[PDB]
Ligand binder design. Structure first.
Ligand SMILES: OC[C@H]1O[C@@H](O[C@H]2[C@H](O)[C@@H](O)[C@H](O[C@H]3[C@H](O)[C@@H](O)[C@H](O[C@H]4[C@H](O)[C@@H](O)[C@H](O[C@H]5[C@H](O)[C@@H](O)[C@H](O)O[C@@H]5CO)O[C@@H]4CO)O[C@@H]3CO)O[C@@H]2CO)[C@H](O)[C@@H](O)[C@@H]1O
Ligand SMILES: OC[C@H]1O[C@@H](O[C@H]2[C@H](O)[C@@H](O)[C@H](O[C@H]3[C@H](O)[C@@H](O)[C@H](O[C@H]4[C@H](O)[C@@H](O)[C@H](O[C@H]5[C@H](O)[C@@H](O)[C@H](O)O[C@@H]5CO)O[C@@H]4CO)O[C@@H]3CO)O[C@@H]2CO)[C@H](O)[C@@H](O)[C@@H]1O
Ligand SMILES: OC[C@H]1O[C@@H](O[C@H]2[C@H](O)[C@@H](O)[C@H](O[C@H]3[C@H](O)[C@@H](O)[C@H](O[C@H]4[C@H](O)[C@@H](O)[C@H](O[C@H]5[C@H](O)[C@@H](O)[C@H](O)O[C@@H]5CO)O[C@@H]4CO)O[C@@H]3CO)O[C@@H]2CO)[C@H](O)[C@@H](O)[C@@H]1O
Ligand SMILES: OC[C@H]1O[C@@H](O[C@H]2[C@H](O)[C@@H](O)[C@H](O[C@H]3[C@H](O)[C@@H](O)[C@H](O[C@H]4[C@H](O)[C@@H](O)[C@H](O[C@H]5[C@H](O)[C@@H](O)[C@H](O)O[C@@H]5CO)O[C@@H]4CO)O[C@@H]3CO)O[C@@H]2CO)[C@H](O)[C@@H](O)[C@@H]1O
Lengths: 159, 148, 148, 159, 158, 148, 158, 148
């Protein structure tokens, strides 16, 4: 036969449909879940330094051509900063536009750096969405932060 | 020369996630809708014969490298058998296993043939064998009918 | 894995043959029409912002690997500058040499932006610099305006 | 940048437009001319046997991925039979549908086998379009005949 | 740049080097371990039927281009035969010549098939290596079986 | 994911030029010498068995994509039959046409095989260019013998 | 099958073989002839301006992936300089090392530029080969000039 | 126009397995021996000048796509500086991470260079793994020396 099939247009019209029907919020949660899932299908070994983890992670991202990543350990607060380039673009959906697949990275990365034996054991992944940084960086560049889960206040425990 | 992103592992986990959360029926209507959606994005010209229509449809399928299709007219009803080969496979989801994307076709062909706002245009698509059993048919061969 | 046919030597001789027989003006209207034609075959969704529109247009251009485009709104008229990079080149035909396919874009963008049957939709495209001189602009960069 | 651009959809909508405006006849003549032209841009050396010419011709067709060809010298009348597979399909135009580019082959081949020093010096190329043969063979398979130009009768000389 | 590096020449000579130093037994255990290792880096989701697992595994194999596979539930032993096409050839090493990487599949399939929660924990994968089963199928075809592990009393030594 | 230059048209003209200026006979020695020299640049390891040698030679062949080979060790007298499939074809030069590159294999195989420890060290290579076992085999299939 | 054969290893050793037997002069004439030959098999259409010819030639070069070229009309000599990027390298042969196929371009450009009906009949192509013109540009860059041929009276010998 | 298998993930697991079971020190000899052995299988012709040797080595390097090399013949004492760019990276193994394959080049270059007639026959290869000329050079750039 021939070189295998194209899923952009599909994802283009899928993302549109899902957006049409579901909150920005609902969609993102579905999309993180899918990230977690992706991270359980493919994973790095147990790396001993962030630097090694980075090489390992890029290796994985190259399996599927989903771009490149840099990991900077911000020792001064002990957070981990995830800077990911060329998130695949699937049409104009997402905030900002072109960036719909972003929360998959959140799922994918949280699954990946948590799998890391003991180190970033119970961290959480926030995406950075602050204005100033987003137009310092290109469209498809996504900035995330990995920091340690602070637990809920009881005031919040009301769901 | 140059190459870029793949989406299939994503769809493997998406299909799964979706199926786990919504069920077969809701997932399928969603998938018909997306099928219809694509059909508004890329489309054939106004074809004069079923044969010509086939070519124009295969051209479009080639564009995204989803499979190939044979349209063939049925003299019983002016009904229309649609045989699609090599539907992209995205893991083991769907019924039968590996045909998760099948409703996209019902939607897609739903749009395309109706685009010919003439004889067909008041028509519908149904996706299984309408003997209601697909006989000796490869996985990734999806058989549909267009009628009314 | 597998690969197939190329059409560029054909277009080199076609462009030439056509130009030799019809002239610049008739060839160009023909080429706008074909531009429009493509625009009915493949098209974006109803975009809400000029930015979103850009992405959806680049997606389509990527589909056939004609170049890339930046749309940018002009606060003087709600006018619209269109900058298209890497128009396919098919030999030395056209003005400037190598831009034979340029009118296809006037036609194509003519269709696409009008598809947004709202603010634009009663608009027109004109293809040269409308300073009427393209300044320090690479060959295969085609600059157009959308107005009225 | 990236792998270079796709001309099918263009040709698809071009062939449609030209057909819309111009006779089947006018178009074919334009298309043969383009064939002649193509044959003047690329050409075989002077081959000494049809068999060699065939290898040479296929070589050229492979430059542009325009399919494969077989040449059988029909000694018994001294005509040359050209059987060409996978004429590139450009939409549904042409007679039969899918076959619009066929008369380019007529131009291309006549130019190619005529360039041949002295041998098929002043032959002409007819396409075979007879019903029976066309559905013995696939869509994109085109059958042509190269035979020696018989001159016009004066009765025909009235244009 | 240009589509990057080829590793066959590396493996042809790496396989030769290793074979020179090391018994064919030790080499196999090494290879089985890496196979078990590969299966930790890339895994299937939890499948409900063998058939699903087969689609799922083939999908994984496709990622790295290591051929295709067919699983077959043999209802009488509750054993499972694994027939794998087009193992990548890396020179003339292994038994038979060309199948050096076969022990890898043993580790790979063993990990993969086990990850499945259902029935399989404490199943072992062993390669079928028998005259006229090797003669019947092309050489880059590797045939394995998956049976339930048994344990051993007298059989404990050392 | 990128790509580079093509030498067929060149080699089509080269063979043509060469055959025109020097004989058929001296063209063939040239190519045998070249074939021999290629063999020095790329070479298999010390092979225990003929089966193993084959895999090894194919490895090398695959690496420059010059087709595939079969080695048949002949029982009756101490021969070694070499069947090479898919010799690169470089225009209509050679005999039969399109087989110009063939002596390269005489040189090439002559080298690889005699580099083999002790068993084959002192062998020759004539290509069996007989019509009887030719009108039956593909144009780009070349049949050789290792003997003495 | 799979995308077919690579000829560099052939040319590396063919170039070496030829160089061994034959003066570097004879080898060049041979190569120039094949270049003239290549230009008979693939040609530009009749161009009106140098610029058009440049688009047209680059188009031909693209067909076989033999690099890109820039032409430049030098108004004073009515001469024409041809600057060609990325000549395919085929081992270390030629002068300088790596440019063996350069004589080919001489034949190629000579044929191509001549096919143009206009001014050029009886123009000759000669390669520029001068210290610090070779040092200035990358090595797979070949610089040639195209001037009108002159003829010779005393200069006829043999 | 077709394509086949990938060994990176394998080699990611292999290095990992190997480093875990055998030392850093014995892993490196293994790889040097392998590198040496690769050098026997593929090899350049007898090179007149160091410049020529470079082109030749790159030719070989390109053939398996293991990156590019520079040879600097050192005047002060009789050294030969080897700078290899784009060593295939095979996971985070090695020191620095992702440079596991590096000793292969010690073996590889050690071989190719000493195969060279008379000038270099008796040389050694230690890779200058100094932080000073490392925190400046790319991770996949490897710097070696030929001496004695
Ligand atoms: O000649 C027979 C056949 O031709 C058809 O026309 C072309 C067709 O245009 C080509 O698509 C097809 O073959 C491959 C294409 O060369 C390649 O461009 C395509 O991959 C596209 C993909 O289709 C597209 O959805 C994707 O979108 C991008 C988005 O726009 C961006 O937002 C995002 O960032 O990136 C994605 C993906 O990169 O772009 C990719 C390009 O990477 O894959 C095709 C199949 O493998 O070739 C045909 C001919 O050569 C014509 O319509 C028919 O009439 C005819 O039968
Ligand atoms: O060498 C350094 C680098 O290597 C990485 O490993 C490889 C990796 O294995 C490759 O994926 C990658 O480059 C391309 C692959 O060659 C190609 O296989 C892949 O496309 C795959 C896709 O990844 C996969 O999801 C897809 O699944 C199929 C399903 O299994 C089926 O159900 C369905 O029917 O079809 C789909 C699609 O066909 O298969 C396709 C193959 O068509 O695309 C990759 C990018 O374009 O190359 C790497 C080598 O560079 C290694 O992980 C890294 O550590 C290391 O840095
Ligand atoms: O080896 C046996 C076989 O070899 C034949 O020679 C080559 C031949 O040179 C190749 O064309 C062919 O396979 C593909 C080519 O690698 C590729 O270059 C070609 O695509 C070309 C296209 O042919 C050409 O028209 C196009 O023109 C450009 C213009 O010049 C520019 O103005 C414009 O901007 O861009 C266009 C397009 O980019 O360039 C493209 C390159 O992108 O496609 C070929 C088929 O897919 O390989 C052969 C080797 O097999 C030789 O002739 C035979 O004798 C012999 O049998
Ligand atoms: O796995 C089975 C098989 O594997 C073999 O190993 C590889 C092999 O290394 C590859 O060559 C082969 O497939 C293609 C290669 O990916 C590609 O590099 C090659 O093209 C090479 C060409 O071979 C080489 O001569 C050429 O030389 C350059 C010069 O060095 C430069 O001076 C000059 O400027 O440029 C030329 C050419 O650009 O480089 C090109 C790269 O462009 O083509 C191969 C065939 O299409 O893949 C195999 C893996 O599948 C292994 O040896 C065998 O043991 C085994 O059977």
């Amino acid at each position: 036969f021939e070189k295998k099939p194209d899923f952009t247009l599909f994802l283009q019209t899928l993302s549109w449909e899902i957006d049409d029907q579901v909150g920005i919020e609902v969609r993102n949660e579905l999309l993180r879940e899918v990230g977690r899932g992706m991270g359980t299908r493919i994973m790095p070994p147990p790396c001993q330094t962030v630097d090694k983890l980075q090489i390992e992670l890029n290796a994985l991202l190259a399996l599927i051509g989903w771009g490149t990543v840099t990991l900077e350990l911000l020792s001064e607060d002990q957070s981990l900063r995830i800077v990911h380039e060329n998130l695949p673009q699937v049409g104009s959906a997402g905030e900002p536009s072109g960036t719909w697949l972003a929360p998959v990275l959140e799922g994918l990365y949280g699954r990946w750096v948590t799998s890391q034996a003991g180190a970033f054991g119970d961290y959480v992944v926030t995406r950075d969405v602050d204005a100033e940084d987003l137009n310092a960086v290109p469209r498809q560049t996504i900035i995330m932060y990995m920091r340690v889960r602070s637990s809920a206040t009881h005031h919040h425990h009301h769901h």
